[PDB]
Amino acid sequence: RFLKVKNWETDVVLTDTLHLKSTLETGCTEHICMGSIMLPVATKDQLFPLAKEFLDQYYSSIKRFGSKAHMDRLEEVNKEIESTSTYQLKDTELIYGAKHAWRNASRCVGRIQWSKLQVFDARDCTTAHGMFNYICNHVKYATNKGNLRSAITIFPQRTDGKHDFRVWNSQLIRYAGYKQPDGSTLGDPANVQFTEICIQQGWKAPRGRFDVLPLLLQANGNDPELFQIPPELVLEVPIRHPKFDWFKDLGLKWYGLPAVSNMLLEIGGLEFSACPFSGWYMGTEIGVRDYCDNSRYNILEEVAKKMDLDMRKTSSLWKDQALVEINIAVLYSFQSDKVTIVDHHSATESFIKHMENEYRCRGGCPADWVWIVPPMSGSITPVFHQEMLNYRLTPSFEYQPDPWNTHVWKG
Amino acid sequence: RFLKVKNWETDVVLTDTLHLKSTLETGCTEHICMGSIMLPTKDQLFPLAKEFLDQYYSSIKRFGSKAHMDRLEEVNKEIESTSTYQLKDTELIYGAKHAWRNASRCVGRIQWSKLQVFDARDCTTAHGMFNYICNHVKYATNKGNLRSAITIFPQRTDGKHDFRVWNSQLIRYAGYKQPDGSTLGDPANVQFTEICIQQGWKAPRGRFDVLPLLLQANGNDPELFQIPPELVLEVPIRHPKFDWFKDLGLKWYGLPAVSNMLLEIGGLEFSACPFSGWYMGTEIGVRDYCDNSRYNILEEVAKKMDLDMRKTSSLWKDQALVEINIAVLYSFQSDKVTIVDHHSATESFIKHMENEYRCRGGCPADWVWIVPPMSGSITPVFHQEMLNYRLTPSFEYQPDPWNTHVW
Ligand code: HEM
Ligand code: HEM
Ligand SMILES: Cc1cc(N)nc(C[C@@H]2CNC[C@H]2NCCNCCc2cccc(F)c2)c1
Ligand SMILES: Cc1cc(N)nc(C[C@@H]2CNC[C@H]2NCCNCCc2cccc(F)c2)c1
Ligand SMILES: C[C@H](O)[C@H](O)[C@H]1CNc2nc(N)[nH]c(=O)c2N1
Ligand SMILES: C[C@H](O)[C@H](O)[C@H]1CNc2nc(N)[nH]c(=O)c2N1
Ligand SMILES: [Zn+2]
């Protein structure tokens, strides 16, 4: 099975064989496409084959497939599984695994960068305090005074499922949201429920529009504990506009480091339930989604007012007009303060080069068009015109349920 | 079995059961999603007819009635003898409206039940086809108060007697390759334009030359025809703020009319079925004008706007895109030619989905196509999960006739 994809703008045709290595399921069937659905304890029996596939992959990557070193590793892992019901990854295998999970992440437009990932091994961590320290170091290293570097920190793997390490925050750095009695929200509405848990856990909320949330960290299946990230470690960028001097008075700012902390990293059947990773922002993530989603900060109207746009009819495209201005402002503000950011034109152009390279050297590149195409100006980016194939490879990042939903409170 | 779709902006959850009546295949498997791929006998005919008649008779609340059973026998008989059958007018109108209703890539379906169906099954020649098409064009255009319409020519027989419109749309602009190396007019229609010239068309060789119609009746070689200019409503493009905009020389036609698809009703294949509605503004302002491989006017517009074109991060492309799209909507509106903006079309489609979920148990929808090519996430459809599946009657793609036709 060889599958072709075409770019309808350049006529470039690519051939995918990599999808043949794909094990897991998509959610689609021969009779239904679920391509726009957001979300469509392992035994000894299942664990050794997962480890074997992984180690075969790894040993092939280093060009030592079938070597004594390969065979001895397989037998040692097999022996460890029979003896302990699980196994430990070598450092080299862990690094390879984390890099490949990113490389395999079909929703990620930033994958050109996949092989430059700083991996921090935190598998010796035992406590929430220890977690807090590892996370501070990650943020400092990743931030690098505005010259952002990709990084991931990997806490100990799942054992019986009763001893999970979890970061309860969905991102390492995010702003509080507060629901007022009149039904309005102060700060980020996406984080209301989590903000409430923090407060209940004893967090003293400043109750402003951009309060950096505390970290809520769970080690070894224990109840999570609160920690405040040192503010000097949180790089933030005040948002202003190069031509509109009133833009600064909206009082907007955002943080520089996007750091996902709620996903599960699977490598060779092992499950790393706390594996916060970070890169740098594409401008639209902030300027389109965080600022302009109706369910988020929702600033379109206010910006449109200040621009004196005709707001009587949608057909004036006043929303579209303000949207662009806001995104100009985000990019200009990050650049002026020398904080790494990428615009959607540049990021998508790089992704196309990446994808073409991946087909040539790897036999394919799994990609989720729904997610890769930016949330503004879709068709003026080269990805809009690129056919893509979505399929699931491991190592992988996976979603997991929010821990407040599953956690057994001890007290 | 039962499937949920959620809207992440409103938290409204809908349940889909209509997918369980899906016959055709998606291109996807359990192992691979092809959601972004653009193009993924006697015995055969009877279950198809029955499947169709059963849904028809259930639609008019006569499922299992004598009229139902009697029609199933009458069709079984005609199939057993002729190897095809003929739709009643009522069935043909129902099948057409439902093919639109079932078009998962169409954002404009709130309108599906107000389709005017022109039965051209009595047509025998290209001149006859030309007459039907002029009438369709004039009826649909309605002096700028556009009305949806489809004209349906005779159904396929042996497949050597096909009626085809060779144009992809009834109305489109010519594309010519130049000594310069660049392209004059619409580059999407370069190959079709050459075939017209090859067939004998005298090209005016301008930027916006309405293509002639190239019509094929009963499997014969196709013939050229100029649509009467007075029947082609065009809109000059100007900007409500920018005086200089008019001087780019831009115009577009008011009537969007797909003529290359195949309409399938109860196993019967209608290879010539031009249909038309009215434009969503972005189809012209984003795609026709700004695609790199289309009129590609972004560089010129950004220049007139004196934007900073040195870095992509000034979002000069995005600023100019918006102004172009404002101009398109302003112009059509000023000329009272029906047009819808992407905000209003997508809001209506969300209302339509909800209607369809409560009334029919679902609405097949292709998110990749429904979400507009600009400002995606500020439209409600962006945040709406959709399930895509294939119901019949339907519109389907077919080979371009020139790659097929035996001369
Ligand atoms: C380095 C610059 C990076 C850029 C510009 C980038 C960009 C993006 C964007 C725009 C998305 C779509 C998510 C959304 O819009 O909500 C995304 C998703 C994702 N990215 Fe990347 N990313 C980068 C680094 C990374 C790194 C370092 C990793 C892991 C090592 C990663 C893994 C993922 C994953 C797993 C998703 C899916 C998130 C989800 O499904 O919710 N990304 N990325
Ligand atoms: C009344 C106003 C209408 C609006 C605003 C509208 C809107 C649209 C849009 C935006 C598309 C995507 C096309 C593209 O980007 O190239 C589309 C596709 C489509 N439409 Fe509608 N439409 C309308 C009427 C109709 C009618 C009357 C029919 C049939 C009777 C129809 C059938 C289809 C089909 C079959 C497609 C997919 C065709 C393809 O894949 O190119 N539409 N429509
Ligand atoms: C590392 C990195 C760099 C970067 N520039 N950008 C990112 C995107 C983050 C990660 N993940 C989405 C973005 N964060 C937004 C939060 N949304 C969660 C996605 C979601 C919601 C609901 C259901 C579901 F299935 C998925 C990461
Ligand atoms: C009836 C109607 C009304 C309306 N507003 N809008 C429409 C969409 C038209 C028809 N169909 C596309 C749109 N016209 C744009 C031309 N593009 C051709 C699409 C295409 C190109 C290459 C390969 C392929 F598979 C498909 C129809
Ligand atoms: C319903 C739909 O699948 C959902 O809104 C998706 C669409 N595409 C996306 N793309 C990105 N990058 N991020 C998102 O959150 C979403 N949301
Ligand atoms: C490759 C990709 O499927 C292709 O560019 C599609 C994407 N979505 C689209 N959506 C619409 N409405 N029209 C199109 O032509 C396309 N093109
Ligand atoms: Zn699919």
Swiss-Prot record, chain A:
Tissues of expression: Isoform N-NOS-1 is expressed in brain and colorectum. Found in the Auerbach's plexus of the enteric nervous system. Isoform PNNOS is expressed in the penis, urethra, prostate, and skeletal muscle, and coexists with the cerebellar nnos in the pelvic plexus, bladder and liver, and is detectable in the cerebellum.
Posttranslational mods: Ubiquitinated; mediated by STUB1/CHIP in the presence of Hsp70 and Hsp40 (in vitro).
Residues where L-arginine binds: 171, 280-281, 285
Chain sites annotated for binding (6R)-L-erythro-5,6,7,8-tetrahydrobiopterin: 36, 370-371, 384
One GO location term (cellular component): cytoskeleton
Domain of life of the organism encoding this protein: Eukaryota
Annotated localization: Cell membrane, Sarcolemma; Cell projection, Dendritic spine
Gene Ontology MF annotations: ATPase binding; cadmium ion binding; calcium-dependent protein binding; calmodulin binding; enzyme binding; flavin adenine dinucleotide binding; FMN binding; heme binding
Keyword annotations of the record: Calmodulin-binding, Cell membrane, Cell projection, FAD, Flavoprotein, FMN, Heme, Iron, Membrane, Metal-binding, NADP, Oxidoreductase, Phosphoprotein, Synapse, Ubl conjugation
Positions of heme b binding: 108, 399
Single GO BP term: response to nutrient levels
Domain remarks: The PDZ domain participates in protein-protein interaction, and is responsible for targeting nNos to synaptic membranes. Mediates interaction with VAC14.
Subunit composition and interactions: Homodimer. Interacts with DLG4 (via N-terminal tandem pair of PDZ domains); the interaction possibly being prevented by the association between NOS1 and CAPON. Forms a ternary complex with CAPON and RASD1. Forms a ternary complex with CAPON and SYN1. Interacts with ZDHHC23. Interacts with NOSIP; which may impair its synaptic location. Interacts with HTR4. Interacts with SLC6A4. Interacts with VAC14.
Task of the protein: Produces nitric oxide (NO) which is a messenger molecule with diverse functions throughout the body. In the brain and peripheral nervous system, NO displays many properties of a neurotransmitter. Inhibitory transmitter for non-adrenergic and non-cholinergic nerves in the colorectum. Probably has nitrosylase activity and mediates cysteine S-nitrosylation of cytoplasmic target proteins such SRR. Inhibitory transmitter for non-adrenergic and non-cholinergic nerves in the colorectum.
Family: Belongs to the NOS family.
Name assigned to this protein: Nitric oxide synthase 1
Organism expressing this protein natively: Rattus norvegicus (Rat)
From Swiss-Prot, chain B:
Residues that, per the record, bind (6R)-L-erythro-5,6,7,8-tetrahydrobiopterin: 36, 368-369, 382
Domain of life: Eukaryota
PTM statement from Swiss-Prot or TrEMBL: Ubiquitinated; mediated by STUB1/CHIP in the presence of Hsp70 and Hsp40 (in vitro).
Sequence positions that bind heme b: 106, 397
Domain topic, free-text comment: The PDZ domain participates in protein-protein interaction, and is responsible for targeting nNos to synaptic membranes. Mediates interaction with VAC14.
Function of the molecule: Produces nitric oxide (NO) which is a messenger molecule with diverse functions throughout the body. In the brain and peripheral nervous system, NO displays many properties of a neurotransmitter. Inhibitory transmitter for non-adrenergic and non-cholinergic nerves in the colorectum. Probably has nitrosylase activity and mediates cysteine S-nitrosylation of cytoplasmic target proteins such SRR. Inhibitory transmitter for non-adrenergic and non-cholinergic nerves in the colorectum.
Name recorded for this polypeptide: Nitric oxide synthase 1
Protein's organism: Rattus norvegicus
